[PDB]
Amino acid sequence: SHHHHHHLEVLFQGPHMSGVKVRREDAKKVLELLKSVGILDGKRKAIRDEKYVIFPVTDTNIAKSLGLEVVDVELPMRPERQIYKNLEDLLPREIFKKLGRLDIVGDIAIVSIPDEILSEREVIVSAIRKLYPKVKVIARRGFHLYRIRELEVIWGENRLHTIHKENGVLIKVDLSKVFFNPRMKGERYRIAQLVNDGERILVPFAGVIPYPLVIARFKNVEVYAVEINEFAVKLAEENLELNRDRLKGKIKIIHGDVFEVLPNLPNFDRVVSPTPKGVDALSLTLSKAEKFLHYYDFVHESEIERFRERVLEECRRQGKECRVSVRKVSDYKPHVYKVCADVEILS
Ligand SMILES: Nc1ncnc2c1ncn2[C@@H]1O[C@H](CSCC[C@H](N)C(=O)O)[C@@H](O)[C@H]1O
């Protein structure tokens, strides 16, 4: 006897050699159609020219029954090995160049996407997933009293809490409720290395206490942390307990308003002020410092001189003899820097 045709039809051992040719204008619609129908060939790459896109397909008879122009073409094989290093390696420059910076916090990727390229959301997500296989959440960043970033989940688990690893500590965060910038890992380590055992240190605006955690992880010191957001305070308490067996130093968490709390504290060897953008806490934080102040601010590159001058002015106003050094910590916007004034109080 013989076989049923609908059993034989799947035996062909060779590869798929055809694709459909569509106007770029119709490319998205057609990609969706081909996926829906089930004949999109994952084994090969699509290509494009000035006016046309060619998608690889698995069944040219079904393609024709979709009204599509079938062509015979040698399309590239899908890559088996990936050597992507940057997001730019995975996107058209016209898309990539419009993206804000990409941050990884725990297993969450955060990216800024202007409305203007929101139509490219799917390839953007694809690119990020490829570059970061382990991330489970991709969120779109808006803008930052508690300085929470506006965030919308655009791929993955519908959550914004995670645990981030940095400088030998564990930091629980919930990005829907608290501020956290992973890019400050350098600064936090830097200050931790400058600190000497036996210091008493004050960190106003402490968030989920990443600065105190890193400092205390490396130095036997006492750190006071002041934070007004009760969600951040809660997470800070949990972070203290989560890291307790690896800290050399001690941390005291105070829930309160810096501008109410600090006038009622004793003074400290060192003050570290990760100031909220736009807020001026220089007088108050310097007033709590006996030997060092590390005061963060955001300054236009044409105003740096004036910034240094104002810091020295406030030093004189408080009767302190100081040397002031201003460092560019990071590029914030074009022509605008996150800076740190390192103030050494002389005796
Ligand atoms: N008056 C005030 N008193 C105490 N904390 C304040 C405050 N105004 C703003 N904040 C807190 O200041 C923080 C600034 S963000 C810096 C967070 C943390 N130091 C870090 O390095 O990630 C936010 O957590 C915000 O809730």
From Swiss-Prot:
UniProt: S-adenosyl-L-methionine binding residues: 188, 205, 227-228, 257-258
InterPro entries xref list: MeTrfase_TRM5/TYW2, SAM-dependent_MTases_sf, TRM5-TYW2-like_MTfase, TRM5/TYW2-like_N, Trm5a/b_N
One GO molecular-function entry: tRNA (guanine(37)-N1)-methyltransferase activity
Enzyme Commission code: 2.1.1.-, 2.1.1.228
Consequence of substituting residue 227 to A: Lack of activity
PROSITE patterns to which the protein is assigned, alphabetical: SAM_MT_TRM5_TYW2
Additional comment: Less efficient than Trm5b and appears to be selective for methylating tRNA(Phe).
Designated name of the protein: tRNA (guanine(37)-N(1))/4-demethylwyosine(37)-methyltransferase Taw22
